[PDB]
Structure 1
Amino acid sequence: IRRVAISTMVQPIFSYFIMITILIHCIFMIMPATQTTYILELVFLSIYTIEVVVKVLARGFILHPFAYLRDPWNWLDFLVTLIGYITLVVLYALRAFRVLRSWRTVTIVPGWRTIVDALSLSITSLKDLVLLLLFSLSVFALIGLQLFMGNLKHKCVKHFPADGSWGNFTDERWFNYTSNSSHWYIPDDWIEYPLCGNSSGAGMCPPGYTCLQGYGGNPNYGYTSFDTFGWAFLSVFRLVTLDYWEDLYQLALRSAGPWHILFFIIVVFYGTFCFLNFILAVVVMSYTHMVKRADEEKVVLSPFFELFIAVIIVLNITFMALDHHDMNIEFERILRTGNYIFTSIYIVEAVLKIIALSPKFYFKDSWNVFDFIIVVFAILELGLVFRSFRLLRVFRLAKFWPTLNNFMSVMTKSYGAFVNVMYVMFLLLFIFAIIGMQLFGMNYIDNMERFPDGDLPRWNFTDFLHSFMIVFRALCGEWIESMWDCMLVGDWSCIPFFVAVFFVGNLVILNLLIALLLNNYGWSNIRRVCFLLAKNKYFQKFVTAVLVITSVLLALEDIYLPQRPVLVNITLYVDYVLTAFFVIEMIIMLFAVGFKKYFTSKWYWLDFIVVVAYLLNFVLMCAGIEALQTLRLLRVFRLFRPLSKVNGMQVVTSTLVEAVPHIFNVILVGIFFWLVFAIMGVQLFAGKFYKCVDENSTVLSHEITMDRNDCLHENYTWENSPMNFDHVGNAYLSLLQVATFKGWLQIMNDAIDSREVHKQPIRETNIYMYLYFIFFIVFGSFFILKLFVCILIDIFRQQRRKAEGLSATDSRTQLIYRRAVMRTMSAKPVKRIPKNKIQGCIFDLVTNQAFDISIMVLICLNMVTMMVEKEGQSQHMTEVLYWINVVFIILFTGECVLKLISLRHYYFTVGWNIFDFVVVIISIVGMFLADLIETYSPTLFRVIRLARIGRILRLVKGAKGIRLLLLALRKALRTLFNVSFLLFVIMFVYAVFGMEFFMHIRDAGAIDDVYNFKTFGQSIILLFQLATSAGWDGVYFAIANEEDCRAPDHELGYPGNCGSRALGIAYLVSYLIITCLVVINMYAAVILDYVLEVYEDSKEGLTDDDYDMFFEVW
């Protein structure tokens, strides 16, 4: 018995058979359930029961160290088998989790130990981070509840009629009228009522309407609001994750006012640019430790011919990329004949190489066999669709391109880890897709009526394909809208599901892929006087002040400038003075530094271009020609000299300058892959996005209009989608939209409905086309776009090592010991004299730890009491809560006074004691000021009531891991501030240029009355939103429009209202490249470095806490 059990278990055939059974079960799970599936499930369950019995007989149940249930895998199998039998005997929410058994398949791919261990270590190490996450999220949720409570209920309500239609005015009649939903303003075809607010810069009502509060529900089926602590917490989490956050951002600013942007600036800065980087650093550290441990464990044959082949390949690539929709006969003739010529040339190539070189030698080389494969596909395709395979020819360019060759070599060197990570990703996606299908499949069908039009949405859990796709979307970073739909048709259980899918899929697996990439990819008197003036500090300070003042003056040129004659005159005279100032400065710099040195520098060249532009403007104005606004706007670029000289700024500029070439190379490689994918997409979807529409922009059913002829016969419009794959440029732009995850829903909606050309699209008639996008997203976003962060991390590490004076040849242990010595050098103790008998007793009581524990408990109680608050509460509840807060404040005051008396004047020898004292003063002052403010603006009262957060901020005191994280953040604060300042300068420059370019465009897309480029504040709001790439598709659609736009009339003075496609493309693409992919990532780099350091001080060395402990006994 025991012998038989052990012999059966040890044989690999047993494990192989179990694994094959698991794989067939997984395959059957995808297909819909039928009668045969029941018997198949029974057979699988019997097999699993045999396996469990054999293992338990071989080993034992728990009662010895090496029993059956001493292995987590055995535990998982046992629980799944028991759930199976429980469901066999008889809720239906437990049969969904049998798919967990599929996790075992991860063991097949060789090398899975490292990936699984890294995942486990990351999960274990997130313990210190989760608590800080919860605390920060709660604090931000409380702030948002205090700021935006009830603001999202604002609506435009029609004024009470004075004609007597509703009867004589009464309070009850007025309430009845205003409560009616038909009297609330809403534009036709809109789903959500627009928000309003009487604050300056907020949404304005149409004439005859008033902005009121407390009417109707909140946006997004009531799931978006700050009315209660839970909803505020959810909104703050959404903002931190940047999940469709621009919608909430715009709603908040439209309801409350532009100034509230400050709030969003904080949560984004601390939540996104810092904490998520802590998670990334933890994942990187885990993977680094595991990989380190694993490693420790242990004529024709002439250059001219090759150049000819390379040029032929490049001209074939351009011929291939020249394909587009609706080609004329001649263009197709040229492409066809060139294709024949290229194929003949390649056949000649193959025969010549086979003859000159021995066939064995020819087939020994990998590139030669690759070329032969290309030749055979070319012959097969010309003989007889095999056109797609022509794309293989493009890859032949890698042989003659050293950068691409090195990229491919690096990729193939470490394919195993990438394969393991991708397999883990797909297995997790499959498990969640199965679970979500089982949990929410029936909800969509049963409660379909709850949807706005009673129609099934595009994304749902009806079948396996849709569930897998929706989970993939959640992994990509978009989960809140799917969760909204699930709550609408489901219950609370959707929240934990989708939310979970976000943590594992996005914050761990993708971070693990980033860590993988990072590890693997990584006269004399005049001259003398002028020199003296030039190197004087006062002259430089004066120049910098003048430049800053002129930049601020530039910021005042808004849409309202023509209405202010005085401001116009100030600007004109300032420009006239600046021309002379620039000329004189150039002359002095020349006389000081010499022609060669002046013209050998890039900064002096920038100054020379600015001078030339201003002189050109001066001569144009003298001649009577209107000055070129861009040329005079060029002086903003002079601010970069003083910016680079800001203390602590050298490291950031050095990192960026050193990283420029690597960024350029990565951009070239991405352009190559995107060209390949764009050719594929053009071949797939060229000209298939046309559809038939009516007066109103709604697509007709294929039944009424079968094709183009019917559409034109019935006098309808045959319209093309703005985003399409008509030619290579449109394909590039669409792929850029897809990669950034902005506007991709519509793109793939059109793609999956695409049919033959000149045919009406049908809903989900080409579903499998999603595959084409999946691959791209895998290879375009998860790999190519993540090289920038790795490059920045490495270069910043090197530059920070350089700045501190450290040697590049030293090893990590040497640096750790050097830090330990430097810290050991500085240390001084101190003692406090105990207090007189009563004072000494009070001192002894206060010094006890139980006192601190009690204070912490009181802080927790007060924080909960703050959480109790909600929108629409009664006056009694509000007053009781305020009185409880007063009691808490008095208790804290008593504690502070007791500590002060006990410690006499030593209270101020500990920084946290000064913090407590300041918080006490602030609380006791703001508490009294609140009554006076409330008795005699609600926004001001809400803002000044923020002082309550100080007394709850004390909860961080006493922690160890949170203390370490805050230590790392404090060390990195200065570099973070410098990066933020650089980002602000870039945003200012882009704001002025955008305000110059797109100030008069007609309201469309994301541009409207509230959000536009009309003023500096609105432009800054839009650019802050765009710095994360959020909603840039709508901005592009608004600014790039060139249809139904009236041209400007110079004679009549009308400025025009028409956009510019090329200018908008350049603007937005350059901004996205500069900010999203380079400047933002810097944050991560900085964080990571500092974070890493502290841990290697805590684990492999000594920390300040160690010295404090040592001196405690001293």
Structure 2
Amino acid sequence: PIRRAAVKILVHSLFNMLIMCTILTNCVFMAQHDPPPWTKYVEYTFTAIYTFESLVKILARGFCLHAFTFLRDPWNWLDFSVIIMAYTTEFVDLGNVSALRTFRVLRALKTISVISGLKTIVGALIQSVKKLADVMVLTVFCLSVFALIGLQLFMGNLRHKCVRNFTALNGTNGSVEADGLVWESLDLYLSDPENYLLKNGTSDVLLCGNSSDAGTCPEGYRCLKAGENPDHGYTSFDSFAWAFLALFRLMTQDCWERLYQQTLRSAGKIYMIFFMLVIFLGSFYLVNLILAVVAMAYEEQNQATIAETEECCPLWMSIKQGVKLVVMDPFTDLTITMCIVLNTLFMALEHYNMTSEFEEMLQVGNLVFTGIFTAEMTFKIIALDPYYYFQQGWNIFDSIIVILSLMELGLSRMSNLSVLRSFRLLRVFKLAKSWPTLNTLIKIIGNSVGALGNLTLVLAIIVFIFAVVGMQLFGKNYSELRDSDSGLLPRWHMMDFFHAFLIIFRILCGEWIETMWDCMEVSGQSLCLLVFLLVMVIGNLVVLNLFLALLLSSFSAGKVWWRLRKTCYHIVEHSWFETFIIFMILLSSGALAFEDIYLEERKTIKVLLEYADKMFTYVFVLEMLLKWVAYGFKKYFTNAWCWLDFLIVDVSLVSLVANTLGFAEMGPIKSLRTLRALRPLRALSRFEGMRVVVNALVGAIPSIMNVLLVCLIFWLIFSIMGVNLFAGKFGRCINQTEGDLPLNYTIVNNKSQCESLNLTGELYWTKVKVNFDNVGAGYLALLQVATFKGWMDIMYAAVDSRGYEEQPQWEYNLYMYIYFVIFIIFGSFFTLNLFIGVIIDNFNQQKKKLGGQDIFMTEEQKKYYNAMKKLGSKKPQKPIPRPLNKYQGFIFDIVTKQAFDVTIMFLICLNMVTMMVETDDQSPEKINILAKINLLFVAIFTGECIVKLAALRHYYFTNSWNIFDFVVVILSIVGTVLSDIIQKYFFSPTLFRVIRLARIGRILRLIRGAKGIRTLLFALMMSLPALFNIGLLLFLVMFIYSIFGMANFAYVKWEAGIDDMFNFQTFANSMLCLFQITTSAGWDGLLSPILNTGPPYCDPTLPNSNGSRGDCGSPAVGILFFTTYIIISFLIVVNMYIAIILENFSVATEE
């Protein structure tokens, strides 16, 4: 029949064009929170077109029995469901919930089939996800184990609050309280939130945990355990569910410093061992294992697809010749490059408040630059005909630049400042021609948009789908439940699809938990948890896959003198001398830890440390002179290690040469004893682990320098744009009575008003600490944004910026968010892609150039590693033990069977489940049942253990896992015995809990049988030595930076990041903050109090003891400290990633 015409229309291209344009118009119509009534037209035309599509598709391969025809492709089910639902909801509404139209978002997924590239992109995505099977089960296993640990240790330790004092008052039958007023029913006093302490500055409730070191409930306040919870209730370790959630937050490192400062403040400073165990083993190892497995699967499928694809004339011509001769002179190219560079450095010289005529000089300079560029344009277009002069793909770009600049300058008599400059800004891209690194960067961007422009489109589709799902679900909830009595909505809601898109973007960045709480408290926990976990998982997976894709794609494509010399070298030969020196260096480094603010008042160890300093300098200068006398000058001064030692000895000498000789003690002389923090640097040349690691690091300096240059110029473009936009728009007013926020611009908008109403000393026009006012500060804001630490304030200050030097408005520039979206997606993401790519390339070719391949490992560690790799052999021989005599034969008849082990492995999972059921203040009746079932479990375990023992007499001690079972049985028996025996000792939440924790050995007894997890744990057992050397170096860096902070950053004003328990006032308080900052967490809050200066925000001339006239550090050294620490920590964790990936590839591919 006419089926021929239907199948003819099916294979058309106009068909796909119609499908695409209609789907896109729909997606434009689905993203509306409130569509006007005239959609019957719209939605009816849409459902008609979709039914027409499906009709054409079924008239081609149907009429009956469609099993080997249409409906055999799974993407047909989607269209079938869409056309079902589109007609379903037009006659029946019994299920009136209005949450069925949010199934319309499934037809926006049909785009993925009518493009033919996204289909195979998603095929690859699913093929990769199919490989994460083992990683997810290992992740949940370790997360649950650590969650049980945190459950035991911090059960109820998150509820402590500094409550007021009270007296029973003995005036009522029930417990009543007297506190100035009268309460009743003690729980009613405690649950009242008026008997709490708001933490300084913030609006939390001060936690205080009764212990020796953690927290300090103040004078008129008892530190008891009573209250709901912090963060509206979603934080405690009380139940296992909340514990699992908090430890997942820890694993994704999402706002984990807050959990850190809330747990250590109430449980114990010594508990940061738990946090440094989780941040290392869970977070940093599991994230890198995910990266490594996804990269391995991607590269494997890429290898597979590559393997498969394997199979008027006189003067005109005279001037033309002269010009073509002169213009192509490479010296003219050099001077044009210098002109471009000078122009970019001229645009940088713009800042917040330029003096008069400085802007005029800048305009004149850029006009001169325009003249130079148009002269080049004409004197090069004189060369040849546009037949060839308009080719090579570079001249067209230059011509577009010149015409844009010419047009924008001709448009001078108009209003344009923001994008006017951007028409001049893109000249920077010119110098990408003769640069072997900007070529690579633009090769990456082009591969992103041109070749691998399908996976980014998949990402955009997914972001749109999730944003509109979130809108449809959670739109109206925010509206009346959130805004204010004043009526202003939160900063992150889902009532626009722009804020919904922003929230999905922020979840992609990693900050998914604050919005999750804001949403859970209005729209129920179930849906709000499912959505925000699906977005997190899927979006981060696809982002990671895009990262690896682009990375790999752009990557793989008299005569007694000579006796005395040897005599004084004979002692340097003796190892005892070097051991003595190592010990003296350890002492001289440790002696720095005691330089804290309690040293002036100790008054006894002070002079001991003075004399120890003198003796250290003496024994070091003597040792250097002896190295000279025994090494001449050539070998010494060419070693480049003892050059560092000589450098240190220089300042150690100058120290005592200045003080006791010249009595100076003034100016930059004390700045030399703040530089003795470098004494631990002598440890680098002696501990072979750190020597090897620093060799590997300094090896990859050049490539790092080139990429630093290119990223610096790219961030320079972004920072000049930021200065053009935001220079002078961050200045807010603050009424200092109760003020950290603007003053409702309708009252005080301009700075003229802000300084024309100072009848009281209250109005302070205080700019944001980090802002865009010159290219110097722009780089700091760019670091904070691209690191996702402190960017909320930068955004909230730019988005609100309604003009130059005037008070902000709540959302007057709502769309300025798009600048930060563009920055985060280009600068941060692509910069980091290029960065990790060049680093892995350098490390890989450095290892390949060597012999013994692996780096970060000393020869002793290499031998230990070559011995360890033989433990997990391909096949350990079968024991097949002697069966037994009569008695033990009848015994072992049953135990050696292959179902007994599975039975035990399920009983032990039942034991895990009965461990999960714990809860704070569970029940007196229930603790009994739980202890009884626990002793029942240990009884069964002892029974199976003794049966297995009676099975084999000597052949029991060979499995190396059976021994582990026996050990856990013994420790469990001892724990059950000691359970109640104590009855006579001191407070034992620090003893009974740690004798109770030993029962998690049974939980760890699971992995005997899960090969997909035995291998993934061998991948860390076999990799521990390199992690250890890297950890030594990291601890050395922590030590040096903590001493620098203790010298400089003590006596700072206590505010946002620096409280009375995390500050640079002693060695422990400083090592805690530096461990927190190592993961780049909350360093924006640590740096904020340091950038203070004279009043307000501080007050100089304070009488603090050692360094007087303080109360607020200086920005210049603080920014340097924190930025260089961030870079160094980043490099070292990159090294960790490389080690993990290398070892995973060495263990997995070997089998």
Q: TM-score range by the shorter chain?
A: over 0.9
Bigger shift: 351-360 or 491-500? 351-360
1:851-1000 pair list within 5 angstroms: 851-933=900-982, 936=985, 937=987, 938-1000=989-1051
Report the residue type matching 2:1119 in the other structure: I
1:206-355 pair list within 5 angstroms: 206-213=218-225, 215-298=226-309, 299-355=326-382
> What residue is the counterpart of 1:632 in the other structure?
676
Matched, 1:498 2:532: yes
Q: Matches of 2:847 and 2:1003 in 1, distance apart?
A: 36
Encode CA deviations 1:383-432: one digit per residue, 9 max, x unaligned. 12333210111112223444323433454467534422222221111010
Secondary structure of 1:1010's match?
A: coil
1:228-627 pair list within 5 angstroms: 228-298=239-309, 299-384=326-411, 385=416, 386-409=420-443, 411-412=445-446, 415-448=449-482, 455-492=488-525, 493-522=527-556, 523-623=561-661, 624-626=663-665
Number of residues of Structure 1 aligned to a counterpart in Structure 2? 1080
Q: Matches of 2:897 and 2:50 in 1, distance apart?
A: 58
From 186, 195, 203, give the equivalent of 2:198: 186
Secondary structure of 1:1004's match?
A: coil
TM-score normalised by length of structure 2: 0.90
> What residue is the counterpart of 1:1096 in the other structure?
1149
Encode CA deviations 1:520-572: one digit per residue, 9 max, x unaligned. 13521122223332233222222112211221222222221222233212211
Residue 834 of structure 1: how far off its partner (Å): 0.6
CA 1:161–1:894 in structure 2 vs 1: closer, same or farther (change >3 Å)?
closer
> What residue is the counterpart of 2:36 in the other structure?
34
> What residue is the counterpart of 2:701 in the other structure?
660
Residue 13 of structure 1: how far off its partner (Å): 2.7
Q: Matches of 1:958 and 1:1038 in 2, distance apart?
A: 53
Kept in 1, the 8 Å contact 2:1051–2:1104? The answer is no
Residue 469 of structure 1: how far off its partner (Å): 0.7
Residue 841 of structure 1: how far off its partner (Å): 2.2
Bigger shift: 355-364 or 535-544? 355-364
Residue 606 of structure 1: how far off its partner (Å): 0.4
Report the residue type matching 2:1134 in the other structure: N
Q: Matches of 1:454 and 1:217 in 2, distance apart?
A: 28
Bigger shift: 305-314 or 453-462? 453-462
Residue 1052 of structure 1: how far off its partner (Å): 9.4
Q: Matches of 2:74 and 2:388 in 1, distance apart?
A: 53
Q: Matches of 1:279 and 1:61 in 2, distance apart?
A: 48
Bigger shift: 652-661 or 589-598? 652-661
> What residue is the counterpart of 1:85 in the other structure?
87
Report the residue type matching 1:249 in the other structure: Y
Report the residue type matching 2:686 in the other structure: P
Bigger shift: 393-402 or 53-62? 53-62
Bigger shift: 115-124 or 625-634? 625-634
> What residue is the counterpart of 2:1062 in the other structure?
1011
Q: Matches of 1:71 and 1:111 in 2, distance apart?
A: 16
Kept in 2, the 8 Å contact 1:655–1:795? The answer is no
Q: Matches of 2:202 and 2:584 in 1, distance apart?
A: 50
From 163, 168, 184, give the equivalent of 1:157: 163
Q: Matches of 2:1088 and 2:1017 in 1, distance apart?
A: 42
Q: Matches of 1:189 and 1:546 in 2, distance apart?
A: 45
Residue 65 of structure 1: how far off its partner (Å): 5.4
Q: Matches of 1:571 and 1:29 in 2, distance apart?
A: 73
Q: Matches of 2:203 and 2:774 in 1, distance apart?
A: 35
Q: CA RMSD in A?
A: 2.7
Residue 455 of structure 1: how far off its partner (Å): 4.5
> What residue is the counterpart of 2:50 in the other structure?
48
Q: Matches of 2:1106 and 2:252 in 1, distance apart?
A: 49
CA 1:1037–1:807 in structure 2 vs 1: closer, same or farther (change >3 Å)?
closer
Q: Matches of 1:537 and 1:798 in 2, distance apart?
A: 36
Encode CA deviations 1:830-877: one digit per residue, 9 max, x unaligned. 430011333112212111122111111111111111111111211221
CA 1:148–1:455 in structure 2 vs 1: closer, same or farther (change >3 Å)?
farther
Q: Matches of 1:656 and 1:1052 in 2, distance apart?
A: 38
Matched, 1:699 2:732: no
Q: Matches of 1:202 and 1:536 in 2, distance apart?
A: 48
Kept in 1, the 8 Å contact 2:264–2:271? The answer is yes
Report the residue type matching 1:669 in the other structure: V
Q: Matches of 1:831 and 1:431 in 2, distance apart?
A: 59
Matched, 1:139 2:145: yes
Report the residue type matching 2:1064 in the other structure: F
Kept in 2, the 8 Å contact 1:655–1:792? The answer is no
Report the residue type matching 1:867 in the other structure: M
TM-score normalised by length of structure 1: 0.92
> What residue is the counterpart of 2:1114 in the other structure?
1060
CA 1:1040–1:943 in structure 2 vs 1: closer, same or farther (change >3 Å)?
farther
From 72, 75, 78, give the equivalent of 1:76: 78
Q: Matches of 2:350 and 2:677 in 1, distance apart?
A: 41
Report the residue type matching 2:596 in the other structure: D
> What residue is the counterpart of 2:11 in the other structure?
10
Residue 287 of structure 1: how far off its partner (Å): 2.0
Residue 947 of structure 1: how far off its partner (Å): 0.5
Secondary structure of 2:1041's match?
A: helix
CA 1:1060–1:61 in structure 2 vs 1: closer, same or farther (change >3 Å)?
farther
Residue 508 of structure 1: how far off its partner (Å): 3.2
Matched, 1:1041 2:1128: no
Bigger shift: 1087-1096 or 131-140? 1087-1096
Bigger shift: 87-96 or 1080-1089? 87-96
Residue 713 of structure 1: how far off its partner (Å): 4.0
Report the residue type matching 1:656 in the other structure: L
Q: Matches of 1:1004 and 1:600 in 2, distance apart?
A: 49
Report the residue type matching 2:804 in the other structure: V
Q: Matches of 2:66 and 2:405 in 1, distance apart?
A: 66
> What residue is the counterpart of 2:767 in the other structure?
720
CA 1:62–1:983 in structure 2 vs 1: closer, same or farther (change >3 Å)?
farther
CA 1:465–1:825 in structure 2 vs 1: closer, same or farther (change >3 Å)?
closer
Unpaired segments of 5 or more residues in structure 2?
A: 179-185, 310-325, 856-867
Q: Matches of 2:838 and 2:406 in 1, distance apart?
A: 43
Q: Matches of 2:869 and 2:1020 in 1, distance apart?
A: 20
Q: Matches of 1:490 and 1:825 in 2, distance apart?
A: 53
> What residue is the counterpart of 2:318 in the other structure?
none
Bigger shift: 322-331 or 494-503? 322-331
Secondary structure of 1:694's match?
A: coil
Residue 359 of structure 1: how far off its partner (Å): 4.3
Unpaired segments of 5 or more residues in structure 1?
A: 809-818, 1098-1102, 1104-1114
> What residue is the counterpart of 1:24 in the other structure?
25
Residue 112 of structure 1: how far off its partner (Å): 4.0
Q: Matches of 2:71 and 2:160 in 1, distance apart?
A: 59
Residue 889 of structure 1: how far off its partner (Å): 1.0
Encode CA deviations 1:784-835: one digit per residue, 9 max, x unaligned. 0233333343444445556673699xxxxxxxxxx99999999755430011
Encode CA deviations 1:60-82: one digit per residue, 9 max, x unaligned. 49956533222221122222333
Encode CA deviations 1:334-368: one digit per residue, 9 max, x unaligned. 11211221111112111211224444443224333
Report the residue type matching 2:1142 in the other structure: D
Q: Matches of 2:1138 and 2:38 in 1, distance apart?
A: 55
Kept in 2, the 8 Å contact 1:106–1:423? The answer is no
